[PDB]
Design a protein around this ligand. Structure first.
Ligand SMILES: Nc1ncnc2c1ncn2[C@@H]1O[C@H](COP(=O)(O)OP(=O)(O)OP(O)(O)=S)[C@@H](O)[C@H]1O
Ligand SMILES: Nc1ncnc2c1ncn2[C@@H]1O[C@H](COP(=O)(O)OP(=O)(O)OP(O)(O)=S)[C@@H](O)[C@H]1O
Ligand SMILES: [Mg+2]
Ligand SMILES: [Mg+2]
Lengths: 451, 451
């Protein structure tokens, strides 16, 4: 009703992700009845939009067994789009794709332990030979070559970001293997889906930041000026910084982050430069979102604050906030867990003149969060999160995370007589046996604390 | 039960140290029934792991008189491994040992007072001649040559850290004699064993620092992120810094120590360089443990703190804590006796978000400590430590240490009419007669104080 901006719409080319029949990386299945509706001929190269602004490039074919409003893609494609089966994507005609000049690709470290021989020969040459594949920068794809299957990451393409791999395309694969861990962290980067029990506020954020920038005309037409300062506040640890993350990854805009404690670590005047530098960067690349985390760290009450350089910054900022022209298309967001200690001049109209309170979550919120956290954890069947949810009164997002981390340990703890700290490697059986029992949770629960 | 990580395991090659029959430095005795179990042929050169990450290299032979799960080594070997008879070690096959190019070895100062003649000729040449001995860098070994026995330290080896001493090996022994005192301090470097009444906490430390680094996969598998900030706290003098020591010596990781009072002694900005420098060093050499002692000295409440450079450091630190990437493999440990005065921003989730309280010890703890302290003291038979333990309620580690020191003096005091301060040297008889009587303790006890 006021969460309207969130419920996404039934549209011609929003299709649910179904498991692939055809097993190929560059292939996507569609119903014939649909392919026509979207004016898409066979073997056309298409553009796919996923989550957290991820993009994939594929070739399209008709599947008899595929529902109209569904689409098939393999796990490699589901990965580049950052979607689980059952999610929904944008399909778009990608007509002006140009042939590939040169591409640089590296293998992942934990997929090359063993023989080198020749990676191009054994793996890449065949996978690409006479294929004419579409690929995007930052694609991770798998190639099987006889005995092994190896994962490669598209480091660079000419032309960026996408090109077709033709016979003329020079393929460079020399370099240091990509580290798995880095690409783990990359998958794990935060989306909107990763924040729980904030639907109401998430709504407001999109309504005040995402909307005014994506469709500035709605405000033009209706004849009102969007607000340009949004201040999130909340009792410590309620995913304020966490949202800061989501937005960065999820936004359409050029995003610039400012960390109060990090600004204040700089030499006198060296911070003022950075403050301007940020606001200048944001204008230069507008539409933009500047985000200030731990605002209170740089904006205490000028009256009540002791150091001299220290007031200069509050003044410095105020000036910039005010120095934002109408035509600028910049929304300044910021966040604190101590709103009341921030200099009131900054909460005056035309500055940070909108607040989004990010409070304690209620019973169902906790349940939401608990789900989001455990989504990649090994849990026993006997684990009831609804129970946890109910028993965790007054916990916040960070309290819950801690809880999970604690039970996980307790679980690891129950294997601690079987294992010695000293051992070079761990018995591979036990490793697989490891899971968080509901009992583990009850222990963690018995240990929990105020926010 | 939750101290599980501590109880070490029965394993194929954990053997108890029994006194040697064969008296040679490079020799280790094993039961034949065992030697087979571990696929170890006679005259094979093995690797031995002791305490505080000490290592020894030997040649292995079968002893008929030696128990299966026992091993014989001389005191010279017991010394390089830093173990008393009755302790337990790792034995490991060391197959790829290379022949020695060049070795540099110096004698100990208090073992060479007298004739030089030629140390290589009299001592080293024969001890090594046609022997083909395995040696490690930092081994201390004893050589008898006619009238005297002399101790040598392995200063350098090529190749480091171990090599076999063949006839081709060039042996250099020129230089300044090693000072006994330094090597006394080296033996004395604190282990885990040296801390008493903290089993519960010791457990947590290994569980949060040692474990996440030695076996990062247990967390990977179970799908949870280990915490990266551990804050020890306790009433003054409870072996917080003492544990800082143990961990350094005992850990597998690269260890970097930061002393709050020492950071704060630096010029403005000179500290900020050191702070970064430390965090950079730790990343460069990961996995690593950064330890901050007397944290409260550098992290007072920014709000409540007066100097300007002073806040800049809290900000400076916070930034770095946060600037730690996931792939970094660094755990920041720190310690204070005044937790409540530390800026709360540092105890937020993802910073110092785990605490280990290092409280007063109970009756048995005191007894533990008293034992650890007196382990190298001259005590009369009439001395009952259980008594002391019971009578010392409310003492902490440092209180107990003081007590011992005080009684020791009282003992020295009882010789003070026999001795005059003026004398150039002390009557050698009385020296040997000196011991701490239980009465001495009762005096020290009568003088004791709150923590
Ligand atoms: N609403 C939430 N949904 C899911 N996870 C959360 C939520 N809130 C907190 N968490 C977890 O707790 C961690 C800390 O959250 P942050 O966003 O850093 O807290 P914060 O609100 O910024 O705290 P302050 O005010 O800076 S002390 C996050 O990395 C999440 O893992
Ligand atoms: N748990 C303990 N076990 C054995 N000895 C201890 C213990 N605690 C203290 N001691 C002795 O007392 C000395 C002082 O201990 P420290 O570790 O320096 O105290 P601390 O807890 O760091 O005190 P603060 O907080 O810096 S005043 C150590 O060098 C030990 O000799
Ligand atoms: Mg935050
Ligand atoms: Mg100390």
């Amino acid at each position: 009703l006021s969460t309207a901006i969130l419920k996404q719409k039934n549209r011609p080319n929003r299709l649910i992700v179904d498991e692939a029949i055809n097993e190929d990386n560059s292939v996507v299945s569609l119903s014939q009845p649909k392919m026509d509706e979207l004016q898409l001929f066979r073997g056309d190269t298409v553009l796919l939009k996923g989550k957290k602004r991820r993009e994939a490039v594929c070739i399209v074919l008709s599947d008899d067994t595929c529902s109209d409003e569904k689409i098939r893609m393999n796990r490699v494609v589901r990965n580049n789009l950052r979607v689980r089966l059952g999610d929904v994507i944008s399909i778009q005609p990608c007509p002006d794709v140009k042939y590939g000049k040169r591409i640089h690709v590296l293998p992942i470290d934990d997929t090359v332990e063993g023989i080198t021989g020749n990676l191009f020969e054994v793996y890449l040459k065949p996978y690409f030979l006479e294929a004419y594949r579409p690929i995007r920068k930052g694609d991770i794809f798998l190639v099987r070559g006889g005995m092994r299957a190896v994962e490669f990451k598209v480091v660079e393409t000419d032309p960026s970001p996408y090109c077709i791999v033709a016979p003329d395309t020079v393929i460079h694969c020399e370099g240091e293997p990509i580290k798995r861990e880095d690409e783990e962290e990359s998958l794990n980067e935060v989306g909107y889906d990763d924040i729980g029990g904030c639907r109401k506020q998430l709504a407001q954020i999109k309504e005040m930041v995402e909307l005014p920038l994506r469709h500035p005309a709605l405000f033009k037409e209706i004849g009102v000026k969007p607000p340009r300062g949004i201040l999130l506040y909340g009792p410590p640890g309620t995913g304020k910084t966490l949202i800061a993350r989501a937005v960065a990854n999820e936004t359409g805009a050029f995003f610039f982050l400012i960390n109060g404690p990090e600004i204040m670590s700089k030499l006198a005047g060296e911070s003022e430069s950075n403050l301007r530098k940020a606001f200048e960067e944001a204008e230069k690349n507008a539409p933009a979102i500047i985000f200030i985390d731990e605002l209170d760290a740089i904006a205490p009450k000028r009256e009540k604050t002791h150091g001299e350089v220290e007031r200069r910054i509050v003044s410095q900022l105020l000036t910039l906030m005010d120095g934002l022209k109408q035509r600028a298309h910049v929304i300044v967001m910021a966040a604190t867990n101590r709103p009341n200690s921030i200099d009131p001049a900054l909460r005056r109209f035309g500055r940070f003149d909108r607040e989004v309170d990010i409070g304690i979550p209620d019973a169902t919120g906790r349940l939401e969060i608990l789900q989001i956290h455990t989504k990649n954890m090994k849990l026993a069947d006997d684990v009831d999160l609804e129970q946890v949810a109910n028993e965790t009164h007054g916990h916040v997002g960070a309290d819950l995370a801690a809880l999970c981390s604690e039970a996980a340990l307790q679980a690891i703890r129950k294997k601690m007589d079987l294992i010695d700290l000293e051992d070079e490697t761990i018995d591979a059986e036990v490793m697989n046996s490891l899971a968080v029992t509901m009992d583990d949770f009850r222990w963690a629960l018995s240990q929990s604390n105020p926010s």
